[PDB]
Amino acid sequence: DMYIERAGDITWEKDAEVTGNSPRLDVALDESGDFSLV
Amino acid sequence: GETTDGVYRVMTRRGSTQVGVGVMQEGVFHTMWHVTKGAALRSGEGRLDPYWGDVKQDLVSYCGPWKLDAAWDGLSEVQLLAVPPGERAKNIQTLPGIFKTKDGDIGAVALDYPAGTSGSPILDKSGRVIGLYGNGVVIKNGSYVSAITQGKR
């Protein structure tokens, strides 16, 4: 069976690790909710 | 059962596995559709019955309508409140990329955490949830980029 457990507050932290780039992609969204590169 | 606002792990029993993550806000549990696929959830003693869902948005809410309506401002950095399987909830800050669709631009974060992190909330500087993590594309080799998926109140 599927159950849920609380994992914390919804909070912005100041001591946050910062990573990742900011790509701009041409994508398409089909009926099944799937994204695809255009 | 657990009414409290906050971020939640969604778990399954075969052993036990974390298949995704969700957000409880104003008595409604928000997660991504592909995580639960419309299956009812257990919250301790009580049960969360599906209320609304949409496969194209890849979203689903429980006990009530979709409550998250905040959106990315298209400029500021955001924070992925990733709740990885077996790991403490952690905030990862990033400057969102952009999904350019024929129906407009969607915020997208270039972070790649395990599948069980699907449904983890993406927050703005105010601490408001602007979307859920776990639906996007793949560029080059293993480079997953998730859209900032938000519903409508």
Residue by residue, DSSP assigns A1-38 as -EEEEEEE-----TT-EE-----EEEEEE-TTS-EEE-
- Residues composing chain A: 38
User: Which residue's entry shows tokens 């409550």?
Assistant: B67
Domain boundaries, chain B: 1-68, 69-153
Residues 6+ apart with CB under 8 A from B63: B27, B28, B29, B48, B49, B51
Inter-chain CB pairs, A–B, below 8 Å: 162
- CA B2 to CA B49: how far, in whole Å? 14
Resolution (A): 2.0
Contact B9 A7 (CB under 8 A): yes
Q: Say if CB B146 and CB B122 are below 8 A apart.
A: no
Are B149 and B31 in contact by the 8 Å Cβ rule? The answer is no
Q: Which of B136, B131, B133 is nearest to B70 (CA)?
A: B131
A1 and B136 within 8 Å at the Cβ level: the answer is no
Experimental method reported for this structure: X-ray
Active-site residues of B, by number, are: 34, 58, 118
Domain B69-153 has CATH 3.30.930.10: no
- Is domain B1-68 given the CATH code 2.40.10.120 in the classification? yes
Nearest C-alpha neighbor of B31 from the set B64, B60, B1: B60
